[PDB]
RNA sequence: AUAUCA
């Protein structure tokens, strides 16, 4: 069915940026701990909490 | 007065290599206050970058 | 997290795809948008802790 | 597509819209620790490693 | 007061495309053979 | 570690680093839960932090093999510092300070390697050879500038860095027979191919010439054509044969000058090898200009 | 206070030495070994101590002793605090100043602001958020992978026993 | 780099049309808009595919191995 | 340490 509205449509130059979900997503539930403080390690990289 | 013993090449060679590498624009592995970030790794994400 | 509303208790809904999905009307308290924002999830480990979340 | 999100034509994505190549490079050295100790490139055996 | 050569002193890093760099007087086809991007 | 439940002699266990557990691969029993990241933990000792802002950076790496265990900071200038107290606390370190100063003979080895264009692995062998033989009664009273000149050839002879004894005679100093006896009392506690790259480079020859000279010299030895001549002479002679065979020639005077040999001596080896010139050359050598095997000087 | 804090106890005569947990060591590869800045700073205190002890024992040259005392004074002092106003910092070979005890507690990222008053935690997860007109107000879309990692410890009970056995 | 087979938006094969387009320009001197249209590329989604292509492959080929 | 992300 026709839309009651008319859509502004045409080509536009879009860029793909360096931020992708899969390089961001992270989850932890017990993992590596620091030596000194005996607390969870830092960063996604290190499987930190 | 042996010439090779007199002039230490490593002085200027590694002295420049340090600055350019690390980025602490000063002498040398004992740097502060030295200005860090003077030399940095060239962004190669896109040509414009 | 300058608000008590910046940390709220939600019902899990396991879904596909790598993003945390939220109802749009809950956007405002968190102060979130989808321009590349990330969010934190904490899981209670006790019946007591769970109650705290669900009940308060 | 609410609050800065967008909808993509999954059909177009299949046709190659916005795909990209990705290359990561891993490095490793075979370091020499003094007169005797030397790291080695080899397939480690789980009994003696 | 009566009176009774060329020495190496160090290695200086060159900036690419400068006078001292090999790539300065390089043509397009030249760079390609050198596996550089024009 | 070995699983308390199973106990099989080859104890098959995995380090599930990602879940921070140490598991028995057979029964699945977790054998440990506290598990630490050694990479990031080592980042706290050897970092990139020279400024002093990193709260993670809290220690420093040392070298127990070379300097033993001498932990010691240095009184120096900080942000809020009077130049007076630095001097006093440093003039106070002077009264507390002989052998803790003979470590500046490492600075003699480091400044010699860098003057001899030697790698970072050679210095650390020369410093370990010197630390384990400078207080020996077997060396007793040898020329103290010729026992560290001998421990540099000891460090080069393990790190595979080709350095003739006459190459270290040019650095310092060396008295030949004096640092030759010292190079043996410590030892109780080169070849043709070695020189060829450098000599050829100075000679300005092409890779083709270098390779052939290198092949001839080896064959000369293999053939045992030169009974006991010094390898340097053999190499210089072989370089003469190959080069003469190719277009860019080099004369005995020029080869000898680079090799640091005498034309007469190069002549001596050369003529010995010449008879078997055919056998000596690489098989796909291309004599050029006008120098074929028949035509080579033969001198 | 006569029991817990007599003024005589402010001037240090004996030095409590903290155990390795407070100043961890690491043994890398037999020619690489890492000691904590405190272990360094302690060794200086000790060395400066052993020195001054020998001076007093021997022929005390008065002014060569007080010279060695105000060195000891510095090492002990700089160990608890390296950021002292007026005094030179104790530096560690690489040019970086020694991480004193004060400085470990001090800032945000200190032991207080950053290991006690806030700390990283397990049973945590993070990713890019996106909206959904089909989720209920109070729910949260959780990616399968995130659900498969995060865990709830449930006690085996007559009520859940069968269900739990199945997930197992 | 290297002509896309099929227009992203509608999937009309555009893989064959490249050389033919480049030819209608050098050999026929024709303007871009007519060449595209000659080649039957009527919808702008299809037009943008050829019109805005950058055949980087040709530079890539300039390197030896 | 610099760069960056909302
Ligand atoms: Mg935002
Ligand atoms: Zn087991
Ligand atoms: Zn189309």
Coordinates of N, CA, C and O in Angstrom, one line a residue, chain E residues 5-24:
Chain E
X5 N 91.3 13.7 8.8 CA 90.5 13.2 7.7 C 89.0 13.2 8.0 O 88.5 13.9 8.8
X6 N 88.3 12.4 7.2 CA 86.8 12.3 7.2 C 86.3 11.2 8.2 O 86.5 10.0 7.9
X7 N 85.7 11.6 9.3 CA 85.3 10.6 10.3 C 83.8 10.4 10.4 O 83.0 11.4 10.4
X8 N 83.4 9.2 10.6 CA 81.9 8.9 10.8 C 81.6 9.4 12.2 O 82.3 9.1 13.2
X9 N 80.4 10.0 12.4 CA 80.0 10.5 13.7 C 78.6 10.0 14.1 O 78.3 10.0 15.3
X10 N 77.8 9.5 13.1 CA 76.4 9.0 13.4 C 75.5 8.8 12.3 O 75.8 9.2 11.1
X11 N 74.4 8.1 12.5 CA 73.4 7.9 11.5 C 72.2 8.7 11.7 O 71.5 8.6 12.7
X12 N 71.9 9.6 10.8 CA 70.8 10.5 10.8 C 69.6 10.0 9.9 O 69.8 9.7 8.7
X13 N 68.4 9.8 10.5 CA 67.2 9.3 9.8 C 66.7 10.3 8.8 O 66.7 11.5 9.0
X14 N 66.4 9.8 7.6 CA 66.0 10.7 6.5 C 64.5 10.7 6.4 O 63.8 9.7 6.7
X15 N 63.9 11.9 6.1 CA 62.5 12.1 5.8 C 62.2 11.7 4.4 O 62.8 12.2 3.5
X16 N 61.2 10.9 4.2 CA 60.9 10.4 2.9 C 60.4 11.5 1.9 O 59.8 12.4 2.3
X17 N 60.9 11.4 0.7 CA 60.6 12.4 -0.4 C 61.6 13.6 -0.3 O 61.5 14.5 -1.1
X18 N 62.4 13.6 0.8 CA 63.4 14.8 0.8 C 64.5 14.6 -0.2 O 64.5 13.6 -0.9
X19 N 65.3 15.6 -0.3 CA 66.4 15.6 -1.3 C 67.3 14.3 -1.1 O 67.7 13.8 -2.1
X20 N 67.5 13.9 0.1 CA 68.4 12.8 0.4 C 67.8 11.5 0.2 O 68.5 10.5 0.1
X21 N 66.5 11.4 0.2 CA 65.7 10.2 0.0 C 65.8 9.7 -1.4 O 65.9 10.5 -2.3
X22 N 65.8 8.4 -1.6 CA 65.9 7.8 -2.9 C 64.6 8.2 -3.7 O 64.7 8.3 -5.0
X23 N 63.5 8.4 -3.1 CA 62.2 8.5 -3.8 C 62.0 9.9 -4.3 O 60.9 10.1 -4.8
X24 N 62.9 10.8 -4.1 CA 62.7 12.2 -4.5 C 62.7 12.5 -6.0 O 61.8 13.2 -6.5

